[PDB]
Amino acid sequence: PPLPEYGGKVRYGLIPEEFFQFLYPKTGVTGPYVLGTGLILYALSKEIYVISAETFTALSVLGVMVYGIKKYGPFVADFADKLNEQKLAQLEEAKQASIQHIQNA
Amino acid sequence: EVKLGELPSWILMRDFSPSGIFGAFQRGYYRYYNKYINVKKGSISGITMVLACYVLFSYSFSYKHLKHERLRKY
Amino acid sequence: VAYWRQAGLSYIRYSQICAKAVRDALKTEFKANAEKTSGSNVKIV
Amino acid sequence: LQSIIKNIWIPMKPYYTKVYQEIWIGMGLMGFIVYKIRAAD
Amino acid sequence: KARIVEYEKEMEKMKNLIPFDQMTIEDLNEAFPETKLDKKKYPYWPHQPIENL
Amino acid sequence: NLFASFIAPTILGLPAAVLIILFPPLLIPTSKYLINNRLITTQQWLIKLTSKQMMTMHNTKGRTWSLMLVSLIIFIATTNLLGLLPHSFTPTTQLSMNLAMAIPLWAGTVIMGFRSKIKNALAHFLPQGTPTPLIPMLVIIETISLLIQPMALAVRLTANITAGHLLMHLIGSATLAMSTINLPSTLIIFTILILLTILEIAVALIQAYVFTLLVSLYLHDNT
Amino acid sequence: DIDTAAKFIGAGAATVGVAGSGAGIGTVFGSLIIGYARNPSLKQQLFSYAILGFALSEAMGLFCLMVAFLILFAM
Amino acid sequence: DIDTAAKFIGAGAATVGVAGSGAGIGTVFGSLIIGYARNPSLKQQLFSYAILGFALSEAMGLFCLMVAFLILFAM
Amino acid sequence: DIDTAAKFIGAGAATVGVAGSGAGIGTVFGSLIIGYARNPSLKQQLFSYAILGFALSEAMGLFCLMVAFLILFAM
Amino acid sequence: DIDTAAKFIGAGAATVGVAGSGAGIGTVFGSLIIGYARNPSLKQQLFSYAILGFALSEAMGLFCLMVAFLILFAM
Amino acid sequence: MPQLNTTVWPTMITPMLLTLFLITQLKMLNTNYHLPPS
Amino acid sequence: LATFWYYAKVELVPPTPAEIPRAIQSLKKIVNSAQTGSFKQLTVKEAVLNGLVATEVLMWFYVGEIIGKRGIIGYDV
Numbered sequence: 001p002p003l004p005e006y007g008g009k010v011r012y013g014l015i016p017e018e019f020f021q022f023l024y025p026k027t028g029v030t031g032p033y034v035l036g037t038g039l040i041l042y043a044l045s046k047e048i049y050v051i052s053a054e055t056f057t058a059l060s061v062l063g064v065m066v067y068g069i070k071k072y073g074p075f076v077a078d079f080a081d082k083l084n085e086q087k088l089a090q091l092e093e094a095k096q097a098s099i100q101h102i103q104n105a
Numbered sequence: 106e107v108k109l110g111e112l113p114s115w116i117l118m119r120d121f122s123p124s125g126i127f128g129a130f131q132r133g134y135y136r137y138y139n140k141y142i143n144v145k146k147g148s149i150s151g152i153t154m155v156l157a158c159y160v161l162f163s164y165s166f167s168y169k170h171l172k173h174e175r176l177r178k179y
Numbered sequence: 180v181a182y183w184r185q186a187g188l189s190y191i192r193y194s195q196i197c198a199k200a201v202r203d204a205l206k207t208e209f210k211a212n213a214e215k216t217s218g219s220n221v222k223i224v
Numbered sequence: 225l226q227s228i229i230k231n232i233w234i235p236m237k238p239y240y241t242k243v244y245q246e247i248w249i250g251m252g253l254m255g256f257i258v259y260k261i262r263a264a265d
Numbered sequence: 266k267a268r269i270v271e272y273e274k275e276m277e278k279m280k281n282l283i284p285f286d287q288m289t290i291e292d293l294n295e296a297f298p299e300t301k302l303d304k305k306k307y308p309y310w311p312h313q314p315i316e317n318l
Numbered sequence: 319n320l321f322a323s324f325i326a327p328t329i330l331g332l333p334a335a336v337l338i339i340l341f342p343p344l345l346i347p348t349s350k351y352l353i354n355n356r357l358i359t360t361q362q363w364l365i366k367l368t369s370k371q372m373m374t375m376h377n378t379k380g381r382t383w384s385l386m387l388v389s390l391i392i393f394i395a396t397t398n399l400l401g402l403l404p405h406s407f408t409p410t411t412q413l414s415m416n417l418a419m420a421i422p423l424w425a426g427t428v429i430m431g432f433r434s435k436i437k438n439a440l441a442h443f444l445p446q447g448t449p450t451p452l453i454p455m456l457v458i459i460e461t462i463s464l465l466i467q468p469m470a471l472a473v474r475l476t477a478n479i480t481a482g483h484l485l486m487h488l489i490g491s492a493t494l495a496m497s498t499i500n501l502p503s504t505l506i507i508f509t510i511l512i513l514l515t516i517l518e519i520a521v522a523l524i525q526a527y528v529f530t531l532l533v534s535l536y537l538h539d540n541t
Numbered sequence: 542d543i544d545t546a547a548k549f550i551g552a553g554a555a556t557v558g559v560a561g562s563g564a565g566i567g568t569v570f571g572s573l574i575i576g577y578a579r580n581p582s583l584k585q586q587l588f589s590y591a592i593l594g595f596a597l598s599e600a601m602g603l604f605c606l607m608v609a610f611l612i613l614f615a616m
Numbered sequence: 617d618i619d620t621a622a623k624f625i626g627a628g629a630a631t632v633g634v635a636g637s638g639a640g641i642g643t644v645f646g647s648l649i650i651g652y653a654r655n656p657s658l659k660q661q662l663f664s665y666a667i668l669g670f671a672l673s674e675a676m677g678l679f680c681l682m683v684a685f686l687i688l689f690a691m
Numbered sequence: 692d693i694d695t696a697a698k699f700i701g702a703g704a705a706t707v708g709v710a711g712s713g714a715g716i717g718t719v720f721g722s723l724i725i726g727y728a729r730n731p732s733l734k735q736q737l738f739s740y741a742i743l744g745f746a747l748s749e750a751m752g753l754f755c756l757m758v759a760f761l762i763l764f765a766m
Numbered sequence: 767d768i769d770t771a772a773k774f775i776g777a778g779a780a781t782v783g784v785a786g787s788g789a790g791i792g793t794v795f796g797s798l799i800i801g802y803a804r805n806p807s808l809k810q811q812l813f814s815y816a817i818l819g820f821a822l823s824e825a826m827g828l829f830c831l832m833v834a835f836l837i838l839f840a841m
Numbered sequence: 842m843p844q845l846n847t848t849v850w851p852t853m854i855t856p857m858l859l860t861l862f863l864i865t866q867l868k869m870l871n872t873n874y875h876l877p878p879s
Numbered sequence: 880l881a882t883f884w885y886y887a888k889v890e891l892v893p894p895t896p897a898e899i900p901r902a903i904q905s906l907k908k909i910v911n912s913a914q915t916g917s918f919k920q921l922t923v924k925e926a927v928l929n930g931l932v933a934t935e936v937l938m939w940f941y942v943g944e945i946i947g948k949r950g951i952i953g954y955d956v
C-alpha cells in the first residue's frame with residue numbers, strides 16, 4: 001500500500017494539532033495556550049518542577065536542538081527525498097532499458 | 106473503543122493478559138508510527154514528541170532526588 | 180595542491196599568466212622586443 | 225510460543241552458533257568477574 | 266516463433282510491473298533476478314561485499 | 319547529591335533502568351518496502367555509510383562481525399545521545415554496563431586469536447624488525463597492555479560520559495548562582511554551557527565511534 | 542581528620558595528569574591545520590584522524606579524573 | 617583546621633592542569649602560522665580550525681577547574 | 692592512621708605520570724595526519740604504525756595507573 | 767609510623783618520571799610515521815631506529831620505576 | 842561514586858545483553874541493501 | 880504582539896452581568912446531574928474536556944495566588 005504524504009501537523013514539535021481543535025470549541029483560540037502558562041506557573045510555584053542545575057542544561061540542549069532543527073532541517077528534509085527520487089529513477093531507467101534488451105531481442 | 110464509550114465496565118471488559126496488554130502497545134505503537142513517522146515527507150516532530158515523552162519519564166523517577174533541592178519550604 | 184590546481188588549471192596555464200604579467204610590467208624600451216621573442220603563432224586544427 | 229523460533233531465533237541462528245561462539249566464551253569470563261566483584265562486597 | 270511468443274509474454278510482465286512505490290524487496294527480486302542477494306555465497310550481513318555496498 | 323543522576327533509577331519501587339536500556343532500538347524502525355519514509359531513508363543511509371567505514375578494512379572472516387560492530391555503534395551512539403536529554407539517566411555512565419560490552423567483545427576477539435591463528439597472534443607481541451637483546455622486557459608490555467585493553471574500553475567510555483555530564487551539571491549550577499547576581503555575566507556563563515553542549519553532542523558520537531573502532535582494531539589483529 | 546584531608550591533596554594532585562591530554566589535543570588539532578594546508582582535497586579523511594587522535598589522547602586525561610574522583614568520593 | 621587547609625594544597629595543585637591548555641593553544645596557533653604560510657589562500661578555512669583546536673583546549677582546561685572547585689567549595 | 696592518609700597522596704602522585712601519555716598519543720596521531728597528507732597512498736601502513744605507537748605510549752601511562760592502584764589497594 | 771607513610775609518597779612521586787617515557791615513545795613512533803611517509807624504501811632501517819629510540823627512552827622510564835620499587839621494598 | 846554500588850549491576854547487564862545482542866541486531870537484519878539492476 | 884491582544888479583547892476580559900443568570904443555569908444543570916445521576920450520561924470524549932477546562936479555570940486561582948504575594952517560586956518568606 002502507498003504511504004500517505006503528510007503526518008500529523010504538530011505545533012512546536014511537542015503538542016499535536018488534535019489537541020488544539022479538541023479544546024477550540026468550548027474555550028476558544030487562546031484556550032489551550034493559557035492552560036500551558038497556567039500549568040507551568042503552577043508547576044514551578046508549588047515546586048513541582050524545581051529549578052535546579054538541570055534547568056539550565058535543559059534550555060541549552062533544547063536551544064541547540066531547536067537551532068539544529070531550524071538550520072539543518074531543510075537540508076536533511078530534501079536530502080532524504082533526493083535519495084529516493086534517485087533510487088526511484090535508477091530503477092525506472094533500467095526498467096525501460098530492460099525492455100530494449102528484450103524488444104531488440 | 107474509548108473516546109466514544111462511557112461505562113466503567115470497559116475497564117474490566119479489556120483483555121488483561123500478558124499477551125493482552127502487549128497487543129494494546131503493539132497496536133498503540135503502529136497507530137503512532139503510521140501517523141507521524143510512516144509517511145513520505147514526514148517531519149522531525151515524529152521524534153521530538155517521543156523524546157518529550159521520554160523526558161517526562163526521565164523526570165518522573167528523578168523527582169525523588171530533586172525534591173531535596175527546593176529553594177523554599179513554605 | 181594550490182587553488183588553481185583545484186580550479187582545474189595546470190602549471191602551463193599558471194606559467195602563461197605569470198610570464199604574461201612580467202612582460203606586461205616591462206618598460207616600453209623592452210616591452211616591444213620581449214613580446215615578439217615569446218609571442219605565440221601556432222594554431223590547432 | 226511460536227515466532228520466538230521464527231522471528232527471534234531463526235534469523236540469529238547463523239550468528240548465535242558459529243560467529244558469536246567465542247563471544248559467549250568471553251561472556252562467561254565476564255559473568256565470573258561480575259559475581260566475583262559482587263562477592264568481595 | 267517459440268522464442269518470440271516467450272519474449273512478448275516476458276516483455277508484458279516488465280510492462281506491467283507494480284508502481285515501484287508499492288513494491289517490496291521480495292518483489293524486486295522476482296522481477297529483476299539481478300538484484301537478489303547471494304545468501305549462499307555470503308551467509309552473513311550485509312550479504313554482499315562491503316565495497317559493493 | 320552531586321552524583322544523583324548516576325544512581326540506578328527506580329519509580330514506584332520498580333527498576334525503571336530496563337525500560338531505558340531497551341528503548342534505543344525503538345527509534346530504529348524497519349520496513350520491507352523499497353521506497354519508505356524520510357526516517358528509514360536517512361537511517362538506512364547512515365547504516366550504509368557507517369558499515370562501509372568500520373568494515374571495509376577487514377578480511378572475509380573479520381567481515382562476519384559486520385552485524386556486531388555495526389549494531390554496536392548504533393547502540394552506543396543512541397544511548398549517549400539519549401543521555402543529553404534533561405534529567406535523563408544514560409546507562410553508559412555505568413561501569414557495569416560498559417564492562418559488559420567491553421569484556422565479551424574483547425575476550426571473544428583474543429580467543430579467536432588464541433583458539434585459531436595462534437601462531438600468528440604470537441608475532442604481534444614481537445614487532446617485525448626487532449633486535450633480540452632486550453626482548454625479555456618487551457614481552458611485559460604487549461601482554462600487560464593486552465590484559466588491560468578490556469578495562470581501557472569500558473573506562474574510556476565511562477569516564478568520558480560521566481565527566482561530560484558532571485561538567486554540564488556544574489556549569490549549569492553556576493548559571494543558577496550568578497542568575498541572582500550580575501546578569502550580563504550569566505549570559506557569558508550560559509554561552510559557555512551552549513558551546514559545552516555542542517561539545518557533549520560531538521563527544522556523544524565520537525565516544526561511540528572510538529569504542530567500536532578499538533573493538534574493530536582488536537578484531538582486525540586477530541582475523 | 543588527616544585521612545579526609547589527605548583526600549584533597551591526592552585528588553588535587555591526580556588531576557594534574559589532564560595537563561598531558563590538554564597538550565596532545567593541540568598537537569592533533571595543530572597537525573590538522575598543517576596537514577590540511579598541504580592536501581586540502583583530503584579534508585574529510587584528515588578530520589577523521591583528528592577525531593580518533595582527539596578521543597584517544599583526551600581519554601588519557603580522564604583516567605586521571607577517574608582517580609581524582611575515585612579518591613575524593615569513593616575512597 | 618587541617619581539613620580546610622588541605623584544600624588550598626589540593627585546589628592550587630589542581631589548577632596546574634591548565635598548563636597543558638597553555639601549551640595546546642601554543643601548538644594550535646603555532647601551526648596556523650606554519651599552515652597559513654604554506655597555503656595563504658585558506659586563511660579563513662584554517663583560522664576556523666584554530667578556533668576549534670583552541671576551544672577544545674579550554675574543554676580539558678575546565679575539567680581541572682571543576683576538581684579545583686569541588687575540592688575548594690563542594691568538598 | 693597516617694599510613695592510610697599517605698596512600699591517598701602517594702596514589703594521587705603516581706597517577707599524574709599518565710600526562711606523559713596524553714601528549715604521546717597526540718604526537719602519534721598528529722603525525723599520522725601530517726604524514727598522511729604527504730603520501731596519502733600509504734594509509735594502510737601509516738595507520739599500522741599509529742596503532743603501534745598509540746599502544747606503546749598508552750602502555751607506559753597505564754604503568755602509572757597500575758602503580759596508583761597497587762599502592763592504593765595492595766600495599 | 768612516619769616511615770611507612772612517607773615511603774608511599776616517595777615511591778608514589780618517583781614514578782612520575784614515566785611521564786617522560788610516555789611522550790618519548792610517542793615522538794619516536796610519531797616521527798617514524800613522518801620518516802616513512804617520506805622515504806618508504808627504508809622501512810627496515812627506519813623501524814630499527816624506532817626500536818632503538820623506543821628502548822632508550824623507555825629505559826629512562828624503567829630507571830624511575832626502578833627507584834619507586836627501591837624506596838618501597840628494597841630499603 | 843554510585844557506579845560502585847554492585848547491588849544493581851545485574852539490573853544493567855541483562856537488559857543490555859537483551860538489546861545489544863538480540864533486539865538491535867534483529868532490527869539490523871531487516872535493513873537490506875539490494876544489488877542494483879542492469 | 881497585537882495578535883495575542885486581538886484575541887484577548889473578547890475572552891480575556893471581565894464578564895457581563897447578563898451572563899450570570901445563564902451561568903448559574905448551567906450550575907443547576909450539573910447539580911441535577913449530581914442529584915439523579917446524569918453524570919452517567921457522559922462519554923469519555925467530552926468527560927475529560929470538562930475536566931481539563933476545570934483544571935484550566937483552577938490555574939487562574941494559582942496565578943492569582945502568586946499575585947497576592949508578589950512572588951513566583953513559592954512563598955518569599
Ligand SMILES: COc1nc2ccc(Br)cc2cc1[C@@H](c1ccccc1)[C@@](O)(CCN(C)C)c1cccc2ccccc12
Binds near residue numbers: 510513517671674681
Ligand atoms: C573565556 O574563557 C573561556 N573560554 C572558553 C572557550 C571554550 C569553552 Br568549551 C569554554 C571556555 C571557558 C572559558 C572560561 C569561562 C568563563 C566563564 C564561565 C565559565 C568558563 C574559563 O573556563 C577559562 C578556561 N581556562 C582558563 C581554563 C574560566 C573558568 C573559570 C573562571 C574564569 C575566570 C576568568 C576567566 C575565565 C574563567
